[PDB]
């Protein structure tokens, strides 16, 4: 049911980390698995990693309001070296806190399938470690672009079709993108 976390969300074996974690990440598709939840979002992502430890600036829009939120996530990256959990605070297009992190909330970020410029993630989020919800997202490097095979392979495995995901390359996203190339520099 909507709330709890999709099954069968499996971490890539063996993900390039040092690939993975770089550059930025634009949303293409995704799915939220509440069938009520049809605000249009956008949304781009920069996760770096080192240490085992991930640390992320994050990116979205809301496409109806027209207003952005910042905010960073922190937290370890699992042996399997494609599934973490973090922690996350509000930051200004500055990088600086606005609101801080709220100790209830965290999120778990799963790394399906990365091939070529594409990748598939799902993000279960969590309140006192209790699932509240998730969401499925193909990325790529670029806003326009289509993804890989491999990706629609990995959505089937779990009886996903992309054709249910919602696409934004038509929607009015506006991005900033060099909040996302500038971090941690
Ligand atoms: C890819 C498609 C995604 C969409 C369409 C999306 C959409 C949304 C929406 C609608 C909200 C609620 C905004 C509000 O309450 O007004 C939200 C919040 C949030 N999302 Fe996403 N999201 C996506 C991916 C992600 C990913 C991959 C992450 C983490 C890596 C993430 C982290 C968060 C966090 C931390 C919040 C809460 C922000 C806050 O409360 O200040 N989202 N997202």
Request: proline residues 4%; aromatic residues 12%; hydrophobic residues 30%.
């Amino acid at each position: 049911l909507p709330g709890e976390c999709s099954v069968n969300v499996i971490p890539k074996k063996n993900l390039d980390k040092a690939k993975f974690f770089s550059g930025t990440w634009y949303e293409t598709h995704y799915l939220d698995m509440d069938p009520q939840a049809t605000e249009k979002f956008c949304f781009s992502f920069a996760p770096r990693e080192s240490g085992g430890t991930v640390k992320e600036a994050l990116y979205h829009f809301n496409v109806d309001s027209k207003v952005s939120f910042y905010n960073t996530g922190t937290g370890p990256l699992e042996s399997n070296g494609a599934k973490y959990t973090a922690k996350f605070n509000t930051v200004d297009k500055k990088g600086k806190e606005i609101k801080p992190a709220d100790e209830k909330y965290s999120y778990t970020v799963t790394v399906i399938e990365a091939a070529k410029q594409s990748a598939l993630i799902h993000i279960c989020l969590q309140e006192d470690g209790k699932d509240i919800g998730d969401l499925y997202s193909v990325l790529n490097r670029n806003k326009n672009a289509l993804p890989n095979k491999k990706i629609k392979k990995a959505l089937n495995k779990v009886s996903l079709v992309l054709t249910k995901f919602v696409v934004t390359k038509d929607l009015d996203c506006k991005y900033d993108d060099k909040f996302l190339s500038s971090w941690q520099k």
